[PDB]
């Protein structure tokens, strides 16, 4: 008896069932929720309007019987007082998306891509630090020649930028990349332009009269029209950079089976193709520059450090090379909380005249000359801002390779399976992918050359991501599904497309990517209307 009882008590204690509940005595055999006065007072007040006490509701529900006649009658009466519209798209076509109106969308990415002009220097493994590279570049003397003019080509706050440039040069000369807090740095960094909190207990109507007091008149964004310069950036980003290996990479591992050899051959081909472009140069510039800025804001907050805008590359087939696109600085990055805010400042070189509509952000300064023969210079001085999250994601922008490879091998394996043979090189070399129009015709090029377009798409998704693009890309899917339905003669339909288009056009504001993609979507539906239906002109 005692052995059995011991085992049983162990197996109860294990399950949390060694209590009066499961093992009560003779008297304590009535377990019940401790109904309280207030709980009942409330429960008796939540019973629906017909009933007035939980008892009536319970008695009516426990005995509820089905009367399908009444239920069907009510269902039909509700089905008649509604009149749900049904709209087959073939009859009711999708009108073209309406784009906002106003001035051209302006450049917003931190670092210039197309315009930016760079300085190269032979790599030194010993001196591999950011500051070490910046000092080495300064020592040759080309950098010390720069002497911006007083009058800028365009923009505002020139004096501050000129003073800061001189102070940066003095800092580097001193081999201490710490800037002092002066009026110019204070104004650009907004060290003290944070509104000071006023207590409410210390308030009175007289205080309200002395200084105006009214609820903040939220200044929603303003609308900007389609950018005509985006296509140029895309075409430029789809060209080689005269250098290769801009973005770093790991070392490919060994192989044992044929499958691994196939994976390594495809990966090698794609990486070789993708390492020579210009977009990848910007990937490298972002990875390294943000890594350095991340490792500075972590160590030296409260000190306006100086960080370069640089990259590392390799001459084609050879030696390595350090490139210096420009210079950055970061105001106090006291990131006490997640999703903080810390202003930075960006100087970047160029050999091109500034557009008014595009380069509205920047404040250029013509800066002497540079050899290649001699050419004028232009010092593009921006003042942007960043956060932790943007930093981490830019520093992990290498993600785009994964997506692009996935799409390419999702096309190649599918094309190869329908024939039960290895058809990848043929698909890559031959399969033609429309990539635009020229002279009213549809241009097309093999996949091997449209990987560049795909990569640029993913990179721009990384760069310009916001709530607007999110909403857009979430609401455009319906249109693409409708397109597919049209392609296969499936008589698709909908309930209220106008509201859908309205929702879409609501999320098109001051973001170049959204607007450009919408214009392209309209051109697509137009070109397909020639060979399909369900779309209006």
């Amino acid at each position: 008896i005692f052995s059995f009882l011991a085992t049983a008590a162990d197996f109860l204690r294990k399950e949390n069932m060694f209590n009066e509940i499961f093992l009560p005595d003779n008297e304590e055999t009535i377990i019940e929720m401790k109904k309280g006065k207030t709980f009942l007072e409330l429960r008796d007040e939540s019973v629906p309007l017909p009933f007035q006490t939980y008892e009536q509701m319970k008695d009516y529900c426990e005995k509820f019987k089905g009367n399908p006649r009444e239920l069907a009658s009510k269902v039909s009466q509700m089905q008649s007082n509604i009149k749900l519209p049904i709209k087959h798209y073939e009859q009711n076509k999708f009108r073209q998306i309406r784009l906002p109106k106003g001035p051209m969308a302006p450049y917003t990415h931190k670092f210039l891509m197309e315009e930016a002009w760079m300085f190269t220097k032979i790599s030194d493994p010993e001196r591999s630090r950011a500051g070490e590279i910046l000092i080495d570049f300064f020592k040759k003397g080309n950098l010390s020649a720069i002497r911006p003019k007083d009058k800028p080509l365009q923009g505002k706050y020139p004096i501050h930028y000129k003073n800061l440039w001189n102070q940066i040069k003095a800092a580097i000369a001193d081999r201490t990349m710490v800037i002092n807090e002066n009026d110019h740095s204070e104004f650009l960094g907004g060290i003290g332009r944070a509104s000071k909190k006023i207590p409410e207990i210390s308030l009175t109507q007289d205080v309200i009269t002395t200084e105006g007091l009214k609820q903040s008149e939220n200044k929603l964004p303003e609308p900007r029209s389609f950018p005509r310069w985006f296509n140029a950036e895309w075409m430029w980003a789809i060209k080689d950079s005269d250098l290769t290996g801009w973005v770093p990479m790991a070392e490919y591992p060994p192989a044992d089976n044929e499958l691994e050899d196939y994976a390594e051959h495809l990966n090698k081909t794609m990486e070789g193709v993708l390492q020579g472009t210009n977009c990848a140069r910007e990937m490298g510039k972002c990875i390294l520059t943000v890594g350095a800025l991340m490792t500075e804001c972590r160590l030296f907050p409260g000190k306006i450090k100086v960080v370069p805008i640089y990259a590392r590359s390799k001459e084609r087939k050879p030696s390595e090379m350090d490139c210096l696109f420009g210079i950055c600085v970061k105001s106090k990055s006291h990131l006490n909380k997640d999703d903080g805010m810390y202003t930075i400042i960006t100087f970047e070189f160029s050999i091109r005249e500034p557009n008014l509509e595009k380069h509205q952000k920047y404040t250029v300064f013509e800066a002497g000359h540079t050899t290649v023969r001699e050419v004028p210079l232009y010092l593009y001085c921006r003042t942007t801002a960043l956060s932790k999250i943007k930093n981490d994601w830019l520093s992990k922008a290498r993600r785009c390779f994964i997506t692009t490879m996935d799409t390419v091998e999702t096309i190649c394996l599918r094309e190869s399976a329908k024939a039960e043979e290895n058809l990848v090189e043929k698909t890559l070399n031959e399969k033609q992918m429309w990539i635009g129009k020229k002279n009213g015709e549809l241009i097309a090029q093999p996949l091997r050359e449209a990987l560049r377009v795909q990569l640029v798409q993913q990179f721009y998704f990384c760069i310009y991501n916001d709530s607007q693009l999110e909403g857009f890309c979430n609401e455009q899917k319906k249109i693409l599904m409708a397109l597919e339905g049209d392609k296969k003669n499936k008589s698709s339909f909908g309930f209220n497309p106008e509201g859908l288009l309205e929702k879409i056009e609501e999320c098109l504001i001051n973001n170049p990517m959204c607007l450009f993609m919408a214009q392209r979507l309209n051109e697509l539906v137009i070109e397909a209307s020639k060979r399909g239906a369900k779309f209006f002109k």
Binding site: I1, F4, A8, E15, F22
Partner: protein
Amino acid sequence: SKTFAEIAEAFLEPEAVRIAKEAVEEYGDHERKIIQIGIHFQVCCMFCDE
């Protein structure tokens, strides 16, 4: 182990479980007691020890 009978079969023999279950059904009491009665019945049978 979603029902009490399985938890009782973990240590109690299933026969005593069935017995206590029938007993609870005849009395009409909660089935949460399938364990306690089963234990008592087992104690008696094992107590007898032929």
